[PDB]
RNA sequence: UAACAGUUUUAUUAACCUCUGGUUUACCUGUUGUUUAUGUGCCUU
RNA sequence: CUUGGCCGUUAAAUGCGGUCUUGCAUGAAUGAUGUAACGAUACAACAGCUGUCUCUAUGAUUGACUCAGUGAAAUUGGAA
RNA sequence: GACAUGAGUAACAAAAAAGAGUUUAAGGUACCUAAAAGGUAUCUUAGAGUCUCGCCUAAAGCUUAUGGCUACGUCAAGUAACGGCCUCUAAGUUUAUAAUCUGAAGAUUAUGACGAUGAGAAAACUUUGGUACCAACAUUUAAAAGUGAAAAUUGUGCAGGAAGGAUAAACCGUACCUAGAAUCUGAAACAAGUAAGCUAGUAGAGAAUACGAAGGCGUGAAUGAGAUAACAAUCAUAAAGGAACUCGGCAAACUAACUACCGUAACUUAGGGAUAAGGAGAGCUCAUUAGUCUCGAACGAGUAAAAAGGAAGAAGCAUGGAAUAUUGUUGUACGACUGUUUAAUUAA
RNA sequence: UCUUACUAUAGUCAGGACUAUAAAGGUCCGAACGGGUUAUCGUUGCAAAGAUAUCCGAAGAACUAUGGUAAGCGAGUGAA
């Protein structure tokens, strides 16, 4: 549940480290794994995103608790997102750690392209 | 807004409430019989007839359980695990009874009752109802069927059973503890 | 008593009057030489 | 944690009968002491005369009691001596015109010191047990249950009845390890002469029946100097 | 509002602001006593 | 399921007031009641205010029947219903969806 | 309050539904036969009987 | 034919505890200080 | 005049800090000016922290409600 | 002045708390019994006590003051175990005297008198100026040891620390109350306020914190019994997020105490900053012991001795285990600083 | 007899820490005690100035006690 003034972990090679949220895209309700928002770079790691510079991100993980179809309940330590442009595609280009898998039934193919665990 | 209660609260603090049910069934059991209220005699019922059923196991955890219940247990525990045990080993529940009376205090007239041990030295339905059976028998009256049904609940379990009825009949008719008692069939012809 | 300094390993009860009354009649606190006989009666005033 | 005994008969050393529950008299309840088998104990390791004397005070108007060694009572006496028996009636001071002499024991040996800080040893140990443990008293005699707790701790005060009793009973070898017996063990015992001094001959009365080794004599040593006279029945 | 002017007030100054002995021995006090004296007060002073 | 005597956020979800800015004794309070002399000098009928809450009938439209065991008696729908265990409810045929079919409320009839 | 309320209208509050009920769950009682009260216990046989139990047993 | 696999989002109103959580002031377990009651309790000949 | 210009801080600065050759209407014991230390003074930022909030829920006690006892007050031209 | 309305409404909520028996006096009922009486049971009024439970505890306990619309059998030559009266005087007062000044009233200086919050011989019997002084602070001292006073000894700092007199038992006080349970001041039976001494023990550096022995209390129905809605007060916990709240982090939370531990920046009036910051350790069991102490016979043994002690060990999610001590850092304005201020809206 | 200042005689300030001192400091942490910073409650209140928490001082320009002095044409006292 990530909602404005939260702080996330960017696990892309796009050039920030930690990130804030400042918007909720497309609903009024908190972004949970695979939905929208609009954050700002407060951190980087050493194209590059520079810190202070506004993008649209994509939650792939979570600490609060996703209940699936199924039954099965998935639970993160960390939240994290991976930072995408305006059309969608991701801005990085190689994603280090695992991304929940309710980004499949998001339209998030791309995303999950490159990701090497998924769970 | 939230659950009901789950039981009554009595408008006291959580310790207060439970050393208020240690108290009344402490002197329950050292006195056999207590007049309280009728909300207190209920409350403590429930936890007068799940200590006797501590009385009545046999591992070390139901004597440690009844020695935290009791606020005298030196005292009152050889009488738990000894004399009420004995009594209630062949009764499968239901050891003690809330009769209502009147107002124990007439200021606040508040609905008060009598919570006793059943078949015990001061069961006030034992002998109610052999006082009930002293006069049908100094009045040459019949026995309806709640008293026949009283007299049978009465002395099913205790020890001696009607023996020990018949003498408290007998010991009521020898006192004319009946005298002045009104023929039931008179009760139709008085206005007071 | 084997050690006398001023540290020495305290087992005794400092309150000595420790639950004892007169007024509720809670009796001697240890046993005494005189607590096995019965209290002497007089003559009243 | 105390124990408070219970009024029901039981057995004295003493050679009288001290109270009506006493069943027997003049019992061994444990081998003579070490001074006891001893015709002459001595003052080993206290003063010059010390234990051949011991007064007795009594408040005159509310029956407080009070023992010392030395012709005079302190402070310490009203604080180690007197326990606390209601609001008002303990008192904070000494005060000299209410506080008098009841008797004093005078023992036949003039140096066995030794047998007196054992009678005033019995004396405060009896004190103690009748302001306390005084099951004797709650149903019967003055019924101190039966009372408030106001009036239950007036007559608490009142200790001049009941020591007048306790000196009979340790003066006739009420209780254990009583050093006025004298065990020969060639073994045959008997008690001490003893002398008592009465400032009133109507207070030795208290006491249903004395030893035969007690002598009553009228007036304390140093009372008439301070222009007291004592009380004396035939008159 | 009043204040409790009173609370620890001693007996000792109440003799010597209001007592008579300051009254009969002033000159300012004779006047306070014959005043009181002619309206038939029983409380002269104190 | 009644819910007794309920205020304004659980009956009508009213936002209620601040916690510790200020706020004196009106923590879950309804607020205003209307306007002044302007809005008809009165409260306006219909006003939402507290009062009982529950106990009141209820529809659920639109749930399917998993399963249908006639030895144990029961008939299993999807979702929720409304009231407490042991309580009479009613189960009819949607009214916003066609009938079963004729085949079907014949071979029941027959 | 703005105007002092009437005779009448408190006269309404005060008696037309709050009258006193009057009891008609009473019984007489079995050992006794006074006026006990329904489903209650005579107070006249119990403080005998309590007592009664008292001295003797 | 079977089998396997796939077949919207947001907002809002209400109901509802199967699931995920929150709560638990007479539930179980662990534990600190201290008091009270009961039992028990050192060495040696 | 005015949210003065510029720079830093904020995703966004009428604020804060620095600076200007910046004074409708600064100024030298109605003292001028800059530090250490001190401050329940006033303003601003960071980290942590949290029911302050997103967005409230549950639980406890005392009142609130009912029965019994005692028994006020402001107020009131009269009121269907 | 009487009597209405609100209204038989609010209130009788200091976050201590009550439960079950027993009993005395007088009186009111019902029955027994009709020879009145008495007995049994119950209710009312005024009490008393027992068992259990809880609250206060460097108090809500005890002993006493100030004081008192509580009540009158409260008892002293003095010391131990007592004050006043009485003697001496301070700050001061004076319708005392003298002198002087002064529209009267009065005022002034000196002397006298009076005036405690101070000083006053002896007793567990008794009647000169550092050769100093008895302000503060520290130190030392009634010899088995420790502790707390008294008085004295010695020393330190500057802010430089009274006066005077000496040296056979009268008269007055004496009861109760000390503010959480019936008494003082607050218009009152008010959650406020008021002096001195004592004020168990465990545990600590401690009068902190927690428990609480005795004692008192858990109010004069000025209340009691139920029920446990909204809402209010006072609290507890909380998914994810962590100031998005708001005039503003208001409130709340985090942090916290302790060690003879480690380490600690810019700047600085060179003292500080600083307990900066930031880290480490802690309870239980135990190897080990130079001395001290104990036991037996130099040595041996012992923590049913105080301590020391280590990279030892055990168990649990957790050993600053419960309670007590409320964040850190940074840039400015104002005023150097500690302090003072509108008793009861502005504390700067 | 409140309160302000002065005055005489008296009393009180657990414990710990730093500092040149055994004792030399309008030093430090913190009870008693003395203040009354912020907040909530209360507002016909328990109180015509109170309750709770929090906060400040706590060897000093400190605090407290029993007396005394100075107040009402002019103004007594006043860290104002
Ligand atoms: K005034
Ligand atoms: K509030
Ligand atoms: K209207
Ligand atoms: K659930
Ligand atoms: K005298
Ligand atoms: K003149
Ligand atoms: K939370
Ligand atoms: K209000
Ligand atoms: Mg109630
Ligand atoms: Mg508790
Ligand atoms: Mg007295
Ligand atoms: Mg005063
Ligand atoms: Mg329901
Ligand atoms: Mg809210
Ligand atoms: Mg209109
Ligand atoms: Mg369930
Ligand atoms: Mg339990
Ligand atoms: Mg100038
Ligand atoms: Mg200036
Ligand atoms: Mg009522
Ligand atoms: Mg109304
Ligand atoms: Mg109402
Ligand atoms: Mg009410
Ligand atoms: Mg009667
Ligand atoms: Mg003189
Ligand atoms: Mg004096
Ligand atoms: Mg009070
Ligand atoms: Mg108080
Ligand atoms: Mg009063
Ligand atoms: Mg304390
Ligand atoms: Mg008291
Ligand atoms: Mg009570
Ligand atoms: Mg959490
Ligand atoms: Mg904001
Ligand atoms: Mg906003
Ligand atoms: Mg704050
Ligand atoms: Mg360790
Ligand atoms: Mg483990
Ligand atoms: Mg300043
Ligand atoms: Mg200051
Ligand atoms: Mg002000
Ligand atoms: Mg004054
Ligand atoms: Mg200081
Ligand atoms: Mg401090
Ligand atoms: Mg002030
Ligand atoms: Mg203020
Ligand atoms: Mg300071
Ligand atoms: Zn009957």
Known sequence: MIQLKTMLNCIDNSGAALVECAMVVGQKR??????????????????????????????????????????????????????????????????????????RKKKWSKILSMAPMQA | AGAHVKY????????????????????????????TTYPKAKEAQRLAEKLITLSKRDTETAR?????????????????????????????????????????????????????????????????????????????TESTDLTKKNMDKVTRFRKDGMRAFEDMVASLRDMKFTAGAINPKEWKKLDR | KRHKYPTARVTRDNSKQRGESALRKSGTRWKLSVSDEPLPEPVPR | ???????????????????????????????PSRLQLKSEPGNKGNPKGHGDRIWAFHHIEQGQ?????????????????????????????????YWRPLAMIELAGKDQGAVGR?????????????????????????????????????????????????????????????????VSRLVKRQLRRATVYWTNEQDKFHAREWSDNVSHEVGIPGEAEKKRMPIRMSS | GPRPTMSGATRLVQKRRHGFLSRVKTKNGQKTLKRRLAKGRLRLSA | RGM?????????????????????????????????????????????????????????????????????????????????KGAVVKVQDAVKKAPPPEEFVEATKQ | ???????????????????????????????????????????????????????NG
């Not at chain 2, 408008?11 to 049910?21: C, G, T, V």
């Not at chain 2, 002197?27 to 019989?33: A, G, P, Q």
């Not at chain 4, 004295?12 to 069943?23: G, W």
């Not at chain 4, 009793?165 to 006739?172: P, S």
Request: hydrophobic fraction near 35%; glycine fraction near 10%.
């Open chain 4, 118 to 182: 054992s009678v005033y040893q019995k004396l405060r140990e009896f004190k103690k047990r009748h302001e306390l443990d005084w099951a004797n008293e709650a149903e019967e005699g003055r019924k101190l249950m039966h009372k408030s707790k106001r009036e239950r701790g007036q007559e608490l005060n009142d200790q001049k009845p009941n020591s007048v009793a306790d000196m009979a009973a340790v003066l006739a070898g009420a209780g254990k390890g009583n050093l006025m017996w004298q």
């Open chain 6, 4 to 84: 007794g005597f309920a205020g304004g956020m659980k009956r009508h979800g009213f936002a209620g007031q601040e916690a510790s800015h200020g706020n004196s004794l009106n923590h879950r309070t309804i607020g205003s009641v209307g306007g002044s002399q302007g809005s008809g000098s009165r409260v306006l009928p219909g006003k939402k205010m507290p009062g009982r809450m529950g106990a009141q009938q209820h529809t659920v439209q639109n749930l399917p029947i998993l399963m249908v065991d006639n030895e144990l008696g029961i008939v299993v729908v999807k979702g929720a219903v409304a009231g407490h």
């Open chain 2, 64 to 140: 440690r359980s009844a020695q935290g219940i009791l606020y005298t247990p030196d005292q009152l525990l050889p009488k738990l695990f000894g004399e009420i045990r004995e009594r209630y080993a062949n009764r499968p529940g239901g050891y003690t009874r809330v009769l209502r009376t009147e107002p124990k205090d007439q200021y606040s007239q508040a609905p008060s009752a009598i919570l006793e041990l059943v078949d015990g030295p001061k069961d006030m339905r034992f002998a109610m109802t052999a006082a009930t059976v002293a006069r049908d028998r100094e009045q040459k």
């Open chain 4, 65 to 97: 009691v009070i023992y010392s060694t030395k012709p005079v009572i302190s402070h310490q006496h009203l604080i180690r001596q007197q326990p606390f028996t209601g609001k008002n009636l303990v008192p904070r001071k000494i005060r000299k015109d």
């Open chain 2, 8 to 35: 009554r609260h009595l408008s006291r603090s959580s310790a207060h409430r439970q050393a208020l049910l240690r108290n009344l069934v402490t002197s329950l059991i050292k006195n056999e019989t207590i007049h």
């Open chain 1, 30 to 103: 908190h972004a949970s794994i695979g939905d929208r928002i609009v954050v700002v770079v407060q951190k980087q790691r050493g194209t590059k995103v520079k810190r202070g510079d506004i993008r649209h991100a994509v939650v792939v993980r979570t600490k609060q608790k996703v209940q699936r179809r199924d039954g099965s309940v998935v639970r993160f330590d960390d939240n994290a997102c991976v930072l995408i442009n305006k059309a969608g595609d991701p801005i990085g280009s190689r994603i280090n750690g695992v991304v929940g898998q309710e980004l």
């Open chain 7, 1 to 55: 309050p703005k105007k002092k309320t009437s005779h009448m209208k408190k006269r309404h509050r005060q008696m037309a539904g709050k009258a006193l009920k009057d009891v008609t769950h009473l019984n007489r009682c079995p050992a006794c036969g006074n006026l006990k009260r329904m489903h209650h216990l005579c107070s006249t046989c119990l403080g005998k009987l309590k007592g009664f139990m008292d001295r």
């Open chain 4, 1 to 31: 944690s105390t124990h408070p005994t219970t009024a029901i008969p039981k057995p004295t050393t003493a050679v009288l009968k001290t109270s009506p529950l006493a069943e027997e008299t003049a019992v061994e309840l444990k081998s």
